[PDB]
Amino acid sequence: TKKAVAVLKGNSNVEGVVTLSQDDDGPTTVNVRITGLAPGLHGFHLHEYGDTTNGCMSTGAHFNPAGDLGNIVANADGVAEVTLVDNQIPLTGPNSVVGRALVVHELEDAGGRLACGVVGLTPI
Amino acid sequence: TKKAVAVLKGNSNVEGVVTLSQDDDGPTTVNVRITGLAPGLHGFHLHEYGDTTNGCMSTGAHFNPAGDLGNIVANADGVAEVTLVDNQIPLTGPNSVVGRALVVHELEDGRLACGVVGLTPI
Ligand SMILES: [Cu+2]
Ligand SMILES: [Cu+2]
């Protein structure tokens, strides 16, 4: 019933697409495909602000109304392809993440900020 | 009381920053600074989708629940610096433009640049 997207870019080689989907006030399906990563674990987080004026730094802190989405795993080719299901990522209501940022880190679970993107509406 | 931002980029040299500000359900102050424009008039619009996966084209059509914000004027240096006040740009409600796109055009009234409308601190 509701879809969002985030195009990930940053001060590095790391780039990707994340799609989020949600039926009503239910759980949220997150499709992560991110390339150019150092093989291994990487912190994947929801930051508070869709602000990209000072790179990934203007996105602020973790979105806690936490916004830690876990680690994602980059294979030997530096590709992290995974599907998450989280319950704390509303696309609706007071706590909508629409208009905030997704950030991928250099380290696991925080690390430097390789790439981010604003969470924008995509068609259903 | 509420602030948003859009960083504009695209398949060209055109880039910029737009900040929007709103008190309650009032009128919305839009600060446009965009560089690298062809001197003259340029269409400045609100598109439906914060989707940048296919450059500015995935942002879709005008945001009509129109989303025409007018023309902006680029000087001899290709800089369009202006402050608009529009009433049809809510940062709140069913019609929030938070998560959509701002798009600047090659003509007045192609897509030179765009940016998703994200939350900035107040
Ligand atoms: Cu983070
Ligand atoms: Cu347009």
UniProtKB/Swiss-Prot annotation, chain A:
Catalytic activity: 2 superoxide + 2 H(+) = H2O2 + O2
Subcellular location: Plastid, Chloroplast
Domain of life of the native organism: Eukaryota
EC class: oxidoreductase
Co-factor binding comment: Binds 1 copper ion per subunit. Binds 1 zinc ion per subunit.
Cofactor: Cu cation; Zn(2+)
GO BP: removal of superoxide radicals
Positions of Zn(2+) binding: 62, 68
Amino acids binding Cu cation: 45, 47, 62, 105
Keyword set, alphabetical order: Antioxidant, Chloroplast, Copper, Disulfide bond, Metal-binding, Oxidoreductase, Plastid, Transit peptide, Zinc
Quaternary structure note: Homotetramer.
Protein family per UniProt: Belongs to the Cu-Zn superoxide dismutase family.
Name recorded for this polypeptide: Superoxide dismutase [Cu-Zn], chloroplastic
Part of the full-length chain shown: 65 to 217 of 217
Swiss-Prot record, chain B:
GO MF annotation, one: copper ion binding
Disulfide bonds: 56-114
The keyword Signal belongs to this UniProt entry's keyword annotation: no
One GO CC term on file: chloroplast
Top-level lineage group: Eukaryota
Chain residues that bind Cu cation: 45, 47, 62, 105
GO biological process, one term: removal of superoxide radicals
Keywords, in A-Z order: Antioxidant, Chloroplast, Copper, Disulfide bond, Metal-binding, Oxidoreductase, Plastid, Transit peptide, Zinc
Cofactor note: Binds 1 copper ion per subunit. Binds 1 zinc ion per subunit.
Positions of Zn(2+) binding: 62, 68
Enzyme Commission (EC) number: 1.15.1.1
Subcellular location: Plastid, Chloroplast
Catalytic activity of the protein: 2 superoxide + 2 H(+) = H2O2 + O2
Cofactor(s) required, per the database record: Cu cation; Zn(2+)
Subunit and partners: Homotetramer.
Family as reported in the entry's similarity comment: Belongs to the Cu-Zn superoxide dismutase family.
Function: Destroys radicals which are normally produced within the cells and which are toxic to biological systems.
Protein name: Superoxide dismutase [Cu-Zn], chloroplastic
Gene name tied to this protein: SODCP.2
Range covered out of full length: 65 to 217 of 217
